[PDB]
């Protein structure tokens, strides 16, 4: 990364059809990691090939076994792109065809052409190929949409888009959760965990299905049947599907009603306002599964034991355990609950030995153990769905120095709430800021309230106008039950292909449904909308449609953190860093510059000494606050003393001196590493008495 | 806090008027009334933004109907240039320069037509209303939405000669998308790789001047600096009233008309005094500067002047070096990370053309000294050696133009120049950019 | 309560305006607040429903009259 130049992060003319020019990381390693194109393949030497069709005198031979070529093979031929239009899949129309010759864009007559690309979307990758109307967007927004399509969460009941692109079934099939019938027979047995297929000949095939398993990112993997008993199936028909697929197709989000207008300041800067129907109808509800582990080692002092008798704990903390001391399957647990009870026989020496020796001589053996059992962390709850126990004498390969391992699985259901991130496929993202009762939302002339309101101010600034096409097509699709599919770069058949297609579909829907308010001729995409609070119509009609939206993995439940006092570092004696270990926030040098520019000196001094590493001032401040008195003045931080010792270790004579007030007496060295006040200095602040 | 009544503004209110009102309120009432005024204005705007029902539609993006003829003329000119290069009369550099200039001029004319059509046809269009009211947008994005994208730039900052002749409402082709990928990559690389230079610069700036603190009240100095306006030829880029606000005079200021004195020696300048000074002539003013302070520390209170955040003299004990460093270093770092907001388009900056309004004949002058010259487009013209005057006489109208030294002239004495014909050109300057190897 | 934060904002602005240095008046307010808190803590109970800094601001603004 450090020794990489700058020509390696650029796009070369030889990348076309072999490496996607859009999908790339957006960090320090941008331009160093790429994605293979959709049609590319690698030969037996290690070079990348791409296919083409040959032309003869001006006719494209679309039935002649396409030719795969390498980057250096096509340098001396005139190659045309995939958007060249032909009469009847035969002769090339027009009189000036753009071609690539010797790594240069040129133009030539439609008789010197040698090869033509197979598809207009041969240049992009799989993720970028799922965005409809992509030629009306910006490239950066396409990259953002491709990136954000991979962060969606599988939902409880997924839905496939009304407006697609034609690549969803293959993407769903080529990843390994869809089960398909291999023969042409009937269905003999269906059950939530087993499917049997009997062919016409008489042999049988059986399949078992996954049920509520865990992924690498604590998501859910689940399979469900599609068919019924006695149904007649064919070859290649889908009989079961995964967690994030509809009946054979990829499904990541949902189709919801959208209007483009501002509300009372709740759409200010890319914020989102939604309805309450999305909560109680279980839309955007997901399932998450977590795993907890515990082990029983053997220390030099004595082996540890997994048991139920936990010293110094109430009876209400052992209701759900059983015999051995392991939680039962099907219990509801909150923070602080005991999952597995472990006790350690340890002989700590921190008490006067007289009582211990007297008890040892007399006898009356009792509990000399410690409690460090497994408890659920703060901010977690759910159901226990699986407990697994591994021990010796069972043919198990445990880690050396261990005698028992226990694993527990906990499942949770999550709904959408304020602070969650939502996004679409065209690079539009936002955070939910308000949830409204359905009687306060705007409603249609039909009387139907809306589902989500988006600010129009962000559409022309971000330059992603494909979402309007998508919404206006989805409106007609819902009104017609049609589920269209469109291929990008559709202007090779005309001049205003997308607009004319959308207008024709909307007019056909208006004629079929019989409602004249669904389409207008003066304002093609706009409808009248009323106010649910007062009943008065708005001044101008607004844009209404159906949008395909997704929910991302950035949830506010995993982002809120606070600290008062916790652990400190061993060397510098400063607060630890990290959410997972009760860490503090860093106050960098730019913030110090800002505080110096403001002129607040006491705030800065209190931040630098009392709150970070003045080992004696911390407890004084805490106890002064508790007792309601003033906070005493600080001393010297520990990091300066550490630096002085480190500098002295390099054979440098560095010390602090006190100026001589009067007389000839020389200046006197000051001992910084000495105690001034006869008071205690513990490692952590504590409440005395 | 009182005694000033607001004026009745009977006009349309855009962002500039709101900023003027906020400044007036702060200057006349204080810092406590301004917050409540801003809160009230915010509430009113929020309330009346949703009553209107502003939305966006596909048919709201209007494209002018005269684009095709403009494009056809551009292709004719480009084909002429390419034929000339093929014959063997110019080199490759001159062809590249000519095509670049032609496409830039075509884009400028197209966006002018777009703005005129949008203003004349419907002033209540949502795109027009929320772009030209100062809300969120700017001209360079509406240009790409309803005009044409134009020329791109690759990550190294160089221009690609193949333009994009479509816009987003019409849809791009495969080649144009491939070309746009270069601007996308340029923005991506610029955002995270070039931001280290600005941070290094601001760290160095903070380190060099972290000990400049106001410690003295007055040093007793008569030295100072001369301040005037910032102009480019005959156009004023920065007026003198904006530069004099908050400074202390080093000498008395006299009206060039009468014996009246506008200010004394050792007087700070507020807005009204600066306006009075500018309105009554006066081209240079001598002021106290930190460059010439005689204090035996860093700076004194009298040689610094106002504090811009509070609109009054500085307080004793202010750390002004930190403020200076983080005022200089912030805008560059912020602007480096906003490059991707416009794709990768090339920001044009062309020469200044002098055009003949009406037909006639050229008279020239008597001090006109010229030499044969070859322009950057591969043309033969005349380069001037001293300032003179060009006289264009017509049927009943006679006009004079002033030609400076260094500009090129495409005409001679006695020619019959038609209407709307180019007469002279002032080329762009090479300053404000770094010089590299060839 | 009858005392809103807006009145405190106006009082603080008035205190800042009628002085030559903002840091000096900030230090004076801090000293007065500390003295008032110490006086409260050792005697009687007082109208405890107001923070010492707000009390110091109120008395200092009332002394301007």
């Amino acid at each position: 990364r450090e020794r990489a130049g700058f020509a390696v992060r650029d796009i070369h003319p030889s990348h076309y059809g072999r490496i996607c020019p859009i999908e790339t990381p957006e960090g320090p390693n941008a331009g160093l990691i790429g994605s293979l194109a959709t049609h590319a393949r690698v030969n037996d030497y290690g070079f990348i090939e791409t296919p083409f069709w040959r032309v003869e005198e001006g006719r494209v031979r679309k039935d002649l076994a396409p030719v795969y070529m390498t980057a250096d093979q096509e340098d001396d031929l005139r190659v045309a792109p995939g958007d060249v239009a032909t009469d009847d899949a035969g002769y090339i129309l027009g009189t000036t065809i753009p071609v690539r010759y010797r790594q240069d864009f040129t133009t030539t007559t439609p008789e010197r052409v040698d090869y033509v690309a197979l598809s207009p979307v041969q240049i992009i990758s799989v993720a970028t190929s799922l965005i409809p109307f992509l030629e009306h967007d910006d490239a950066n927004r396409a990259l953002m949409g491709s990136n954000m399509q991979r962060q969606a969460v599988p939902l409880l009941r997924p839905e496939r888009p009304l407006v697609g692109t034609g690549l969803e079934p293959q993407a769903a099939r080529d990843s390994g959760m869809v089960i398909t019938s291999p023969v042409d027979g009937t269905i003999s047995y269906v059950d939530a965990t087993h499917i049997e297929v009997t062919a016409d000949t008489g042999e049988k095939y059986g399949y078992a299905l996954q049920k509520y398993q865990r992924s690498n990112q604590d998501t859910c993997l689940n399979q469900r049947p599609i068919v019924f008993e006695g149904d007649r199936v064919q070859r290649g028909q889908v009989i079961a599907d995964g967690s994030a697929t509809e009946k054979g197709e990829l499904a990541l989000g949902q189709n919801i009603l959208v209007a483009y207008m501002p509300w009372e300041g709740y759409n200010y800067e890319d914020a989102i306002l939604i309805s309450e129907r999305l909560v109680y109808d279980d839309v955007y509800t997901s399932i998450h599964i977590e795993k907890f582990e515990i082990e029983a080692r053997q220390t030099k002092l004595g082996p540890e034991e997994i048991t139920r008798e936990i010293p110094n704990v109430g009876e209400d903390a052992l209701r759900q355990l059983d015999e051995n001391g392991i939680i039962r399957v099907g219990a509801w647990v909150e923070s602080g609950d005991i999952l597995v009870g472990k006790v350690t026989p340890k002989g700590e020496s921190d008490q006067p030995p007289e009582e211990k020796l007297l008890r040892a001589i007399f006898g009356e053996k009792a509990r000399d153990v410690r409690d460090n059992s497994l408890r659920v962390p703060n901010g977690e709850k759910g159901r226990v769905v699986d407990v697994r126990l591994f021990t010796r004498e069972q043919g198990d390969e445990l880690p050396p120095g261990a005698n028992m391992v226990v694993r527990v699985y906990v499942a949770q259901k999550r709904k959408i709430q304020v602070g969650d991130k939502m996004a679409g496929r065209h690079g539009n993202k936002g955070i939910i800021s308000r949830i409204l009762p359905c009687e306060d939302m705007p409603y249609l002339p039909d009387g139907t309230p809306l589902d989500i309101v988006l600010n129009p101010l962000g559409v022309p600034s971000r330059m992603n106008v494909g979402q309007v096409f998508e919404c206006m097509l989805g409106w007609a699709g819902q009104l017609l039950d049609a589920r269209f599919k469109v291929t990008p770069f559709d202007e090779m058949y005309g001049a205003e292909a997308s607009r004319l297609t959308v207008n024709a579909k909307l007019s056909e829907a208006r004629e079929q449904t019989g409602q004249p308010w669904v389409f207008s001729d003066d304002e093609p995409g706009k409808i009248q909308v009323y106010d649910g609070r007062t009943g008065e119509p708005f001044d101008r009609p607004v844009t209404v449609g159906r949008a395909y939206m997704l929910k991302l993995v950035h949830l506010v439940d995993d982002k809120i953190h606070a600290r008062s006092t916790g652990p400190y570092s061993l060397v510098t004696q400063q607060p630890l860093g990290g959410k997972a270990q009760q860490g503090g926030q860093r106050f960098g040098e730019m913030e110090v510059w800002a505080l110096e520019a403001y002129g607040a000196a006491y705030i800065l001094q209190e931040l630098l000494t009392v709150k970070s590493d003045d080992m004696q001032g911390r407890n004084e401040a805490l106890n002064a606050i508790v007792k309601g008195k003033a906070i005493p003045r600080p001393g010297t931080p520990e990091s300066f003393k550490v630096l002085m010792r480190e500098l002295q270790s390099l054979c440098l004579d560095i010390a602090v001196y006190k100026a001589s007030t009067e007389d000839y007496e020389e200046d006197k060295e000051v001992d910084l590493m000495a105690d001034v006040n006869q008071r205690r200095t513990p490692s952590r602040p504590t409440y005395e008495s | 806090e009182a005694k000033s009544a607001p004026i009745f503004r009977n006009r349309v209110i855009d962002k500039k008027q709101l900023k003027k009102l906020i400044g007036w309120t702060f200057a006349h009432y204080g810092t406590a009334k301004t917050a409540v005024v801003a809160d009230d204005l915010k509430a009113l705007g929020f309330r009346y933004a949703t009553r209107a029902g502003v939305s966006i539609s596909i048919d709201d993006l209007k494209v002018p109907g005269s684009k095709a003829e403009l494009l056809e003329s551009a292709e004719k000119r480009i084909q002429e240039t390419e034929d000339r290069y093929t014959r063997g009369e110019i080199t490759e550099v001159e062809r590249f320069q000519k095509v670049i200039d032609t496409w830039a001029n075509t884009n400028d004319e197209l966006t002018d037509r777009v703005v005129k059509n949008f203003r004349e046809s419907d002033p209540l269009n949502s795109v027009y209303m929320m772009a030209f009211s100062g809300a969120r947008g700017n001209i360079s994005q509406v240009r790409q939405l309803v005009g044409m994208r134009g020329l791109m730039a690759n990550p190294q900052g160089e221009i690609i000669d193949l333009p994009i002749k479509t816009n987003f409402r019409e849809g791009l082709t495969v080649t144009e998308y491939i070309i746009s990928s270069y601007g996308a990559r340029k923005g991506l690389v610029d955002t995270a790789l070039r931001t280290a230079d600005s941070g290094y610069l601001t760290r160095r700036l903070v380190d060099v001047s972290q000990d400049v603190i106001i410690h003295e009240v007055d040093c007793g100095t008569s030295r100072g600096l001369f301040v005037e306006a910032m102009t480019d030829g005959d156009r004023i880029l920065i007026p003198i009233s904006q530069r004099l606000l908050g400074r202390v005079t080093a000498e008395a200021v006299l009206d060039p008309s009468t014996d009246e004195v506008l200010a004394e020696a050792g007087q700070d300048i507020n807005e009204d005094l600066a306006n009075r000074i500018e309105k009554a002539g006066i081209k240079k003013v001598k002021v106290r500067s930190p460059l010439t302070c005689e204090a035996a520390r860093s700076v004194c209170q009298k040689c610094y002047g106002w504090s811009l955040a509070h609109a009054q003299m500085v307080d004793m004990g202010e750390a002004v070096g930190i403020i200076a460093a983080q005022s200089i270093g912030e805008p560059g770092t912020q602007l480096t990370m906003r490059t991707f907001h416009t794709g990768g388009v090339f920001t044009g900056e062309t020469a200044r053309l002098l055009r003949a309004p009406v037909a006639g004949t050229i008279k020239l002058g008597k001090k006109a000294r010229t030499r044969p010259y070859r322009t950057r487009h591969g043309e033969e013209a005349l380069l001037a050696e001293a300032n003179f005057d060009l006289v264009l006489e017509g049927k009943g109208r006679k006009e004079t133009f002033a030609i400076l030294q260094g500009s090129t002239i495409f005409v001679q004495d006695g020619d019959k120049v038609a209407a709307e014909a180019i007469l002279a050109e002032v080329p762009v300057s090479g300053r404000t950019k770094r010089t590299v190897e060839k | 309560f009858d005392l809103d934060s807006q009145d405190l904002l106006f009082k603080a602005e008035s205190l800042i305006v009628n002085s030559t240095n903002r840091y000096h008046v900030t230090l004076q307010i801090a000293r007065r607040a500390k003295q008032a808190r110490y006086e409260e803590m050792e005697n009687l109970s007082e109208e405890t429903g107001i923070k010492p800094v707000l009390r110091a601001i109120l008395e200092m603004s009332d002394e301007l009259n």
Binding site: V592, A601, Y602, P634, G635 | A319 | -
Partner: peptide, 16 residues
């Protein structure tokens, strides 16, 4: 330098 050793900076309210 007063930041490293933990003293009042000589600017602002810590001027004197």
């Amino acid at each position: 330098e007063n930041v490293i050793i933990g003293r009042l900076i000589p600017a602002g309210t810590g001027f004197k």
